[PDB]
Design a protein around this ligand. Structure first.
Ligand code: SAM
Ligand code: SAM
Ligand code: TQB
Ligand code: TQB
Lengths: 380, 380
């Protein structure tokens, strides 16, 4: 019954993640002034350039130059020696109003609770009892390794670190009637941008001793664990200079690390009317409520929408064999306890609040007791 | 045992799909002259703009203006009345060479068979016996509905159609020991950009009679099937003008429609050394070989890599309960029959051939007998 599973994560300075954070900094800036802002902000990053492209209709007065540059500063790209500098990069803006055709079909002259979905699409929520936070251990560990790198960079412990990083964790699991049980860490990859002075052996030693050992419990590591630390051998060029980034290109890092399922929609840069985000957060909330409610050890929920239509077109459940209840029974419990219209999700999950930039690195789920992470007490 | 499942697809003029097609037109243009071109071409589209951003190291001499404009022309955006025109749009280029740090760690001075993976990451392949092409019926039907729209647009049957479209199909299934059996179509959504003259009732009637009935077998449609046709009510503004597009923002449309799993990587604009594409194609090839070989009715395969390392770090199998063989036995059969090093996949799947633009709409899988769609005869 043993098997392997792998997930990855990326750091705050990974170029795709820079774009997600900037998109969400823009969304938050709008929501701070106009809780009803309609935002669809894509970000593109390449050497010396942040471009904003998309559609925003809002009563806010937002200084895009300042918002973008402050987000880049926070990430840590503050000098040309690091390959990118918030003070001196180009910020280009190609933002128009929301299409009036979309606006009239989705939200104009609609009661909020009865607002239409902002697009068609499908979304999934997942939860697993293998960790207290109801997330896969593979992706939890991968995120924590990137967070540790940023911590040691920011506290000056490892001053040769730069913001761009990737990690990948392969766990060996056992299974019991569909639930999964972590046994050990089989393989770890860490790649992180670094300065010109540090040598490879110094980096590899620090990554094992100060990063991996500070994150992964020793009980999971043994003489057979495989370590791929700085496997490319050199990573001085990094950030947008090494690889163009775009918003919504880390959707699996943002969610479940390959476990569960994904409908394809990106989260960052979108207000609540874009069900790609709000309905995925609500589906996570449902899945976590089913697991924390003791109805199943792990579960997947699908929901779907049509643009302009408030109620979901479909809802589906897969319990992996981890419930005594059938999937039909669990679906009835979901329908009795949740209303997945976007105009109701916004109220339940407080989705006009400007907390989105906080979600845009280290995963949207399993952290910080956001509203979608607080289970609903189920009645049945 | 009945349940619903939903998948979507988009047309050739959907702005994200425009970007995937342009990225792959650029890749093909390079490969026509330099089979060993290193290409990582992202495309961004917004009103009046195509921007290319990324990294290319190649001996080819490519005229980006011509390649981009010809791709847009093929899609059908050829007049300002349609919201976008290949003749007069802005084409901006922000392309640099591949990072020398990546090049030295991946492929420089390496035997081709022993080339390293171009990045870390995880990838999945999936196959299901529910259709001859081994794809989910939900996504097959969703793709065919977009193809039908483009066909009726191009043949002048429905001259009010424009290139930007989305479709979504919810199928009601039964199941038998993990295999899935389509019963009926529960809901169909179609949204398509249109001219200023056609009325809503004319469009809805044509979408039902000339599009849906021409694609979906009557046996799946009944008096209870729900139709959401032009549900926003008006879709005159479309293409990049209505919504900014980016390469790699339709990764679920490109693959399995929510079924199976996804590792997060985008396909378009990347040469074979980027395992996001090559290893996902090889994983599809493995999954389809297991199903067509009669070892299982449906199956999911995971593979993962570290940048600079040729052999996969992990391989995993999930057979949904549809094989008499254990997943451990199926994994041994896979390891005996396949070599998923990128430098071997390139040879098996002929991945230097410039056929990539053909993959960039209507899904990468289940069509045209590409090499990854031709099962391998298994020995065990
Ligand atoms: C390897 S790059 C993708 C391929 C790249 N666009 C190319 O031109 O080959 C993807 C990510 O890997 C990381 N990366 C960049 N340079 C790297 C290096 N020298 N070694 C390891 N990882 C690197 C960065 O996080 C980057 O965003
Ligand atoms: C609805 S838009 C995404 C949200 C949009 N960025 C906004 O500002 O609200 C996503 C896709 O839906 C389609 N679309 C655009 N305008 C539409 C309309 N008026 N009705 C229906 N679908 C539309 C296009 O395929 C577009 O790429
Ligand atoms: C318990 N177990 C053996 C697995 N559980 C799973 O949830 N999936 C999985 C993941 C995503 C989508 C669908 C299934 C697996 C997938 C693979 Cl490739 C291997 C093992 C598993
Ligand atoms: C047979 N059956 C009931 C389903 N089969 C599946 O493959 N998945 C599924 C899809 C992606 C990832 C993991 C599982 C389902 C998922 C849902 Cl939400 C509902 C039903 C199913």
């Amino acid at each position: 019954g043993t098997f392997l599973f792998t997930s990855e994560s990326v750091g705050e300075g990974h170029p795709d993640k820079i774009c997600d954070q900037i998109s969400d900094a823009v969304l938050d800036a709008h929501l701070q002034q106009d809780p009803d802002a309609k935002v669809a902000c894509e970000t593109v990053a390449k050497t010396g350039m942040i471009l904003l492209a998309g559609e925003i209709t809002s009563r806010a007065a937002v200084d895009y130059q300042k918002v973008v540059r402050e987000a880049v500063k926070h990430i840590g790209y503050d000098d040309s020696s690091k390959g990118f500098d918030y003070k001196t990069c180009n910020v280009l803006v190609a933002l128009e109003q929301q299409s009036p055709d979309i606006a009239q079909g989705v939200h104009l002259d609609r009661n909020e609770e009865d607002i239409g979905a902002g697009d068609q699409g499908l979304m999934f929520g997942y939860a697993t009892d293998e960790t207290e936070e109801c997330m896969p251990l593979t992706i939890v560990l991968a995120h924590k390794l990137n967070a540790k790198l940023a911590e040691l960079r920011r506290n000056g412990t490892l001053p040769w670190l730069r913001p761009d990083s990737k990690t990948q964790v392969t766990v060996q699991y056992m299974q019991d009637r569909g639930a999964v049980l972590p046994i050990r860490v089989h393989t770890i990859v860490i790649s992180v941008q670094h300065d010109e002075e540090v040598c490879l052996d110094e980096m590899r030693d620090a990554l094992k001793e100060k990063v991996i050992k500070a994150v992964v419990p020793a009980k999971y590591l043994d003489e057979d664990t495989i370590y791929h630390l700085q496997p490319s051998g050199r990573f001085v060029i990094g950030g947008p200079q090494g690889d163009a980034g775009l918003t919504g290109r880390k959707i699996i890092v943002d969610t479940y690390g390959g476990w569960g399922a994904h409908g394809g929609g990106a989260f960052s840069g979108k207000d609540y009317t874009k069900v790609d985000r709000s309905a995925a957060y609500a589906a996570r909330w449902v899945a976590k409520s089913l697991v924390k409610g003791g109805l199943c050890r792990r579960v997947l929920v699908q929901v779907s929408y049509a643009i302009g239509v408030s109620h979901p077109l479909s809802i589906s459940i897969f319990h992996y064999g981890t419930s005594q209840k059938s999937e039909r029974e669990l679906l009835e419990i979901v329908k009795k306890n949740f209303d997945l219209r976007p105009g109701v999700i916004v109220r339940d999950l407080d989705l006009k609040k400007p907390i989105y930039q906080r979600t845009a690195a280290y995963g949207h789920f399993g952290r910080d007791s956001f509203p979608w992470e607080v289970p609903k007490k189920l009645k049945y």
